[PDB]
Amino acid sequence: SASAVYVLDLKGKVLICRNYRGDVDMSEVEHFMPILMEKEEEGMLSPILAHGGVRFMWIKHNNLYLVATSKKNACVSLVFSFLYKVVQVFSEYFKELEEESIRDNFVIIYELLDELMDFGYPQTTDSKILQEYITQEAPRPPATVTNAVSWRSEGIKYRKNEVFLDVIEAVNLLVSANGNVLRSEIVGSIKMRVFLSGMPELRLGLNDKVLFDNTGRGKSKSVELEDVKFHQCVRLSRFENDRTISFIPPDGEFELMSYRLNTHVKPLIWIESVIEKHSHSRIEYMVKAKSQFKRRSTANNVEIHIPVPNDADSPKFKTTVGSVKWVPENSEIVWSVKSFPGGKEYLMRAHFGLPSVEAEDKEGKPPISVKFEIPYFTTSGIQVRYLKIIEKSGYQALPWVRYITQNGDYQLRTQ
Amino acid sequence: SKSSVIGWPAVRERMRRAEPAEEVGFPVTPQVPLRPMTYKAAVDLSHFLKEKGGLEGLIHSQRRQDILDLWIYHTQGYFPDWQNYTPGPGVRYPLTFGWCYKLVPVEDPEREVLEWRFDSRLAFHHVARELHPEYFK
Amino acid sequence: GNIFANLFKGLFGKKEMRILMVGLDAAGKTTILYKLKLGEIVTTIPTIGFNVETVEYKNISFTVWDVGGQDKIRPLWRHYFQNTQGLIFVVDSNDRERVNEAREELMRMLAEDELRDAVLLVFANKQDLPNAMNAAEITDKLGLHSLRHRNWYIQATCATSGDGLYEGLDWLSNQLRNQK
């Protein structure tokens, strides 16, 4: 229940503001910057600010803080969801999130803000629906918003019905400094870019453990996702009733389902780090990486970031496979590898000097994270059964999907 | 299917070698379609197995069934889930409609000896579906 | 098919061979590897990761992958066991307390079905002080005679002196290569 949502800037200048209820004066935004500065200087800065009896919730954007001032005890979750929807709409409409587009599309920005929500209650949130009624370069509102199916616009015609799926896998491993993995969770991502004619209703079917158990086929490799979140077009009633994933696919790229379950398997890459740091004399980087993934799978664009000393200089790298580059801005050496086949063993030997004068304050031990991304690999073993594409007119669809495995929160605790 | 005919003798030899009673990861072939075996495809596979032999009368085993399913998936891309047997005790009808292969006793259900037997009526009569309507949805 | 190219390659030497570097930490494994590859006693920090190098002798390029005996690196020795044809064990004759740990690590490594075709190669390290054991006391303590189906040879090598490395290399070559 934010009184007014405004877009700020890095210098504190409000790029654009639009009051929704009028219960909060527009002058409260000026005091938001000093409050944020005081909180940052004292560590008390929070996204949800509080200017007396009015709370100015702000979200750190790419170039400006999306401050949404509120007066009463409005739904914080609802305000956050509205801000996220507005950010997504802006990203869809404007490819750049900076001050360049804030002052360049104000004429359409004001109309979009007015149409998005009224009296603090959001009304329009579909990017396609908003673009079909508000454009930067007006007819009556589309019937899709008024109709029940607000995620699949009717009347779409395409020469061919091709849908591109993406089996995105996020391998997050939390290995402590003792060598034991604490947080090992893999979050699935079923994103499909449906581009066909009409408004077909997708009939999702995969090798789900729950579905296999219900159908009596709970003996093969079935993916048991601890948390599965359906898309907006996905009907929750069918999923709750018999796990039937029946919903109208969106027009374009959309996230239908997102699996999320813990992983009890060994990490795809086993990295052993050695720190032979002398007392203000030299430093040793005994980094050894072992590929625990299948040999048939190669990790493309693997970048194992090893945090080097903050004041370290004149470093020498003695590695075997993969180029190592030290970035002064990042204050660490990333073990960049173009192609890393499964089972590969890369050994590195860092050697650099240190300044004679010791540091005045400690800098901490940031965890070592890798940027491995091996596609065409299904670590979870979940196999899609079929995709029920049904249209009233009747057409033969040719859906496509690719399985991509990448490294997410694969951070290794430093010694 | 020349590839299927070639793989049938090796699969039969591997099944015979395995008694009736190391690499991690899940690599996927690029561009290879994956879908469950159809009723017509299951019937054709059962007929081919019956004609070539080595499937009817063989002792049913978990290792042999897994090897056969893996060979079928490698040769045609069909998921190794349609080669299921009906719940016991007794003769286990095919889980997927259209399958011409079923497991029947040859003498706890696990300790009972099962043997693969051809069944033409299985492809036309949903015995497994009738026995377990809940499993068939 | 034709094997003329293989015969031509083997006439002048084509066999390379492989080797592994295992043992207790600070047991001279890195120093032994440096002596085998370079030939000098090079001072190095603890083996946090691993050392990879190759040694050419008798027309055979036996690559040696030195692995430390640290707790954080002991479980990592299985990574180097893949695609490995040889294994060299470094013992600590001057470290009585670490002798039991080294023996336990060797027994655990030898109890793996993957490392079965590799012959035993134990180097009598710490051969610079009178406290170092002989070629029989160390073998008896480690129980090398109880390793069935394992070709183990006892060789004493001193990192500072370098004597005995040639004998161990010859024994390893004889165990691996059985040609004229």
Next chain:
Amino acid sequence: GNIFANLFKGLFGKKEMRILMVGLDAAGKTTILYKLKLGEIVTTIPTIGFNVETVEYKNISFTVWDVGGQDKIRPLWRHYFQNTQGLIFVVDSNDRERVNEAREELMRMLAEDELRDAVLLVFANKQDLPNAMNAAEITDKLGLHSLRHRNWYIQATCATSGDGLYEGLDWLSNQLRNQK
């Protein structure tokens, strides 16, 4: 790449080398540095800070950074150890009481991993009175033979006379430069 410029530079002499000035305070280190650079016995106050100079001999510009042996300057010797390739030790043969302190300082300096590639260079200072020891008594007292992996040479130099400085410089050049 091309190394024609490097060869042309080395044909007429390009190597410079480095050196360090360490030892007990009032041990002739500053006088030795003045003799090496200028060639006269110049009287100077105590080395509160440090003396930086360069000496050119045999086409090599060996810069010498004299450091005093004072308590407030002894811990500062680590600052000059960075980017240092040579080290010259000044002993006090006429200072029996300070001999133990100089030996302890030399042992502490030699016990640093950073100063490992620098060869030992001890100058027999105070070589003007009969109380000064010979080239073997000073080395035995300092335990130069117990410094493993250290190339130490005993040279006697008198600040007033200047004899022996050439021998020490030649020994240092031979230790550092191994060319024709």
Next chain:
Amino acid sequence: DRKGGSYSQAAGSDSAQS
């Protein structure tokens, strides 16, 4: 081709489930 796994054809449903 494309990095991250080549696109593969998908079926319409589980043909073995009837």
